[PDB]
Amino acid sequence: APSFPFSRASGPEPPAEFAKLRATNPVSQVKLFDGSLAWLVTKHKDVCFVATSEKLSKVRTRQGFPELSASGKQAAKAKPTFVDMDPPEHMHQRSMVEPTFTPEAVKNLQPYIQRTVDDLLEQMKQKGCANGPVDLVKEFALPVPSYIIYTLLGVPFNDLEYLTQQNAIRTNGSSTAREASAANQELLDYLAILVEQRLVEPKDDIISKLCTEQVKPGNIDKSDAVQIAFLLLVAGNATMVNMIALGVATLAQHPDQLAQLKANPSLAPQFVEELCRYHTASALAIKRTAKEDVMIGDKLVRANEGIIASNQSANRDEEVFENPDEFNMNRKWPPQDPLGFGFGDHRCIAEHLAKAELTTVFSTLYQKFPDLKVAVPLGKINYTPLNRDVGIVDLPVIF
Numbered sequence: 508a509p510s511f512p513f514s515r516a517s518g519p520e521p522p523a524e525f526a527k528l529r530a531t532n533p534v535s536q537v538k539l540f541d542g543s544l545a546w547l548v549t550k551h552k553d554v555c556f557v558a559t560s561e562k563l564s565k566v567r568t569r570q571g572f573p574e575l576s577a578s579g580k581q582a583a584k585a586k587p588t589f590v591d592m593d594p595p596e597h598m599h600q601r602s603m604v605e606p607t608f609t610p611e612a613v614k615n616l617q618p619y620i621q622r623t624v625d626d627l628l629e630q631m632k633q634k635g636c637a638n639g640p641v642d643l644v645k646e647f648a649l650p651v652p653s654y655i656i657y658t659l660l661g662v663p664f665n666d667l668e669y670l671t672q673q674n675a676i677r678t679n680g681s682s683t684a685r686e687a688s689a690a691n692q693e694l695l696d697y698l699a700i701l702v703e704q705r706l707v708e709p710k711d712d713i714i715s716k717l718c719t720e721q722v723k724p725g726n727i728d729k730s731d732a733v734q735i736a737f738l739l740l741v742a743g744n745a746t747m748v749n750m751i752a753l754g755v756a757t758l759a760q761h762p763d764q765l766a767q768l769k770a771n772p773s774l775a776p777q778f779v780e781e782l783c784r785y786h787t788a789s790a791l792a793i794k795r796t797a798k799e800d801v802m803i804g805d806k807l808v809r810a811n812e813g814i815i816a817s818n819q820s821a822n823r824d825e826e827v828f829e830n831p832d833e834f835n836m837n838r839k840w841p842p843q844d845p846l847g848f849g850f851g852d853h854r855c856i857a858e859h860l861a862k863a864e865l866t867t868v869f870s871t872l873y874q875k876f877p878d879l880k881v882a883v884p885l886g887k888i889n890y891t892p893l894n895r896d897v898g899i900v901d902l903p904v905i906f
């Protein structure tokens with residue numbers, strides 16, 4: 508049994524193991540950091556099965572749950588939020604914050620998403636690059652998702668810049684464990700104050716909705732509200748930042764497609780669809796433990812055994828996506844859903860918001876800066892460590 512997680516084949520590539528497994532051993536056992544074994548599912552059909560099977564559980568207190576790191580095992584001891592719940596607890600809590608994320612709500616949020624992106628681009632423009640390249644991540648990829656989620660949660664405008672930086676410290680590879688935890692606790696402390704404030708004078712934000720609709724009636728307590736808000740903040744922010752950076756690098760990598768997008772920003776939606784399939788920046792989030800024996804392919808997964816379903820591998824499944832390793836914004840899509848945002852009841856609560864943010868970014872970025880260029884050889888791009896989810900740490904650009 509090979510050690511898992513696997514390392515990316517290269518900066519922008521998925522682990523080399525997946526293609527081989529899909530072809531010769533689609534359901535196999537891997538060895539986790541603690542020596543425990545877990546089942547790795549690599550084919551699209553099987554990943555979808557794992558994502559929806561009622562015989563599987565997301566509860567982390569079940570022995571056999573596939574924790575991939577030492578820190579992961581420790582976090583599993585805290586009270587859980589809906590991300591780690593099974594029905595009926597799952598939807599009971601998730602439905603408390605879903606309203607803001609519905610397709611309809613996101614459609615109505617479009618003008619706000621657009622102005623947020625416009626303002627950040629204008630700021631990046633006036634900041635210019637006369638004295639050299641600027642870091643697209645720091646100046647744009649990071650603040651876009653950050654300002655939007657913080658604003659939705661209820662953070663006032665003047666606190667956005669500082670809070671965006673602190674949340675980034677949580678996941679920056681450079682941060683020491685102390686700095687990372689300090690930033691973590693600080694954000695939690697801050698949200699605690701927001702909850703107290705909104706309980707007294709509710710405003711138009713997620714935190715206020717939680718306070719008025721759930722805390723006051725006694726459905727959840729103040730700390731629960733803080734944790735739910737915290738989950739919404741940290742769940743996908745870093746992923747969003749990476750997706751934006753990865754999108755820019757990919758366009759640089761394939762000049763012809765950037766030409767097409769520039770000539771027709773209306774292609775943004777399809778470019779984003781291909782991007783979320785090709786670059787599956789969240790690939791270790793579909794995990795379960797079998798509540799009872801379950802057969803998957805030619806294997807029997809016994810009760811209490813763990814399962815990791817790779818949506819990254821599923822997104823490269825040649826049986827579903829023709830020429831899977833080819834990035835093609837004009838790809839002819841099959842009826843099967845690409846899995847960048849997961850599948851089933853737990854499917855990313857912010858999928859529509861995330862896609863709206865990316866679509867807005869890629870339908871505007873090159874309109875603002877038609878000559879935007881990565882200021883370093885693409886082969887020199889600073890990607891996230893190979894033993895982590897795909898992403899980009901910094902991206903120098905000129906325009």
Ligand code: HEM
Nearest residue numbers: 590739742743747789792848849850853854855856857861
């Ligand atoms: C492009 C960026 C994003 C990607 C690629 C992404 C991907 C995912 C994936 C793979 C999952 C697992 C779904 C499953 O269990 O099947 C997920 C869950 C989740 N995501 Fe995202 N996400 C993104 C952005 C966001 C944002 C912006 C937020 C917060 C506003 C967010 C909040 C969540 C939450 C709370 C969950 C847990 C949902 C549940 O278990 O019910 N995501 N996301």
